[PDB]
Structure 1
């Protein structure tokens, strides 16, 4: 009754019609890596890590926004799947400079974990590594847009949950600032909620900015106060 067959590495599982391939593959357990898909957001097409080969096909589709056709059989661990991932991961680490000590998501990046688990052991490409003057947003959010990967995730959060429309992609080619064109203070509600979303250390907290590191801390379950939601 309205389910679709897919094969994740040959294994059959049943699909509600209209979902993405990425949702089914993380239904069966395969945590396919990603940089712009986000479950609490709409789907852009900028991550490019979501590529995966499916057989009987000349080329490789994106698994982020592909509706489930009938009877799939996906190659999540083929040769050219890992070759495409090694490609994209080698591309991302060009214009993201050597600030991994002085980062603020140093324990909790995503280029870190996914480049250790998918990327290349050696790199190439001596020159390049372009730089951007950091903008200002407000004295609550510290903003270093050199480490930004232009992944268009802050923008979707702004124009959906904030709706304030302050963040913009300006420029072309390589040079594409994610920022406010007019140096206007983005100081409204939920402006503090963007920092758990920018997956690199581009957007970060201002008072916390240079204090500690995630491994030394420890988590503890707790309840919000001062508000009726908790």
Structure 2
């Protein structure tokens, strides 16, 4: 992209939806890519996320006040390209450039999902999926996460 702005108007602001204790939403950052909608419907098999409204006011969410509690729900954090959906437990604790990445395995079940353990200064910061086509692909369970 370009290195400067020529937008001289005020910006849209969107209210924040609540969808459980795991995924925090700041939906003003959403870019309406519908990755989360497609993941919930196709991978998780839950049709509770969609778009409401039209045009510039189109909003991603549940319309009603509803939690998105699925054993795969945390994966929408990874696939959201922006900070619209983020890990609530991880909030504010670290920055990516300072974390050490340890490639490891999950022991919360017998699948053996491949993971990355992000550490910083000798402390575990979070757990991310590690791509393995023959096991977990690029997902993990919420318990693993």
TM-score (norm 1): 0.48
Match of 1:177 in 2: 59
Matches within 5 A, 1:39-118: none
| 1-structure distance, mates of 2:33, 2:10 | 20
Say whether 1:187 aligns with 2:69.
Answer: yes
User: Unaligned 5+ residue runs, structure 2?
Assistant: 113-145
2:23 maps to which of 108, 116, 141 = 141
| 2-structure distance, mates of 1:151, 1:226 | 32
TM-score (norm 2): 0.75
Cα deviation, residue 211, structure 1:
0.7
The structure richer in strand per residue is: 2
Poorly superposed stretches of 4+, deviation over 2 Å: none
| 1-structure distance, mates of 2:45, 2:106 | 25
Say whether 1:222 aligns with 2:101.
Answer: no
Match of 2:3 in 1: 121
User: Unaligned 5+ residue runs, structure 1?
Assistant: 1-118
- CA-based RMSD: 0.9
Match of 2:92 in 1: 210
The total of aligned residue pairs comes to: 112
Cα deviations across residues 105-148 of structure 1 (Å, max 9, x unaligned)? xxxxxxxxxxxxxx112210121310001010001110110000
Give SS of 1:156's match: helix
Structure showing greater relative contact order (alpha-carbon pairs closer than 8 Å, 6 or more residues apart) = 2
| 2-structure distance, mates of 1:149, 1:226 | 34
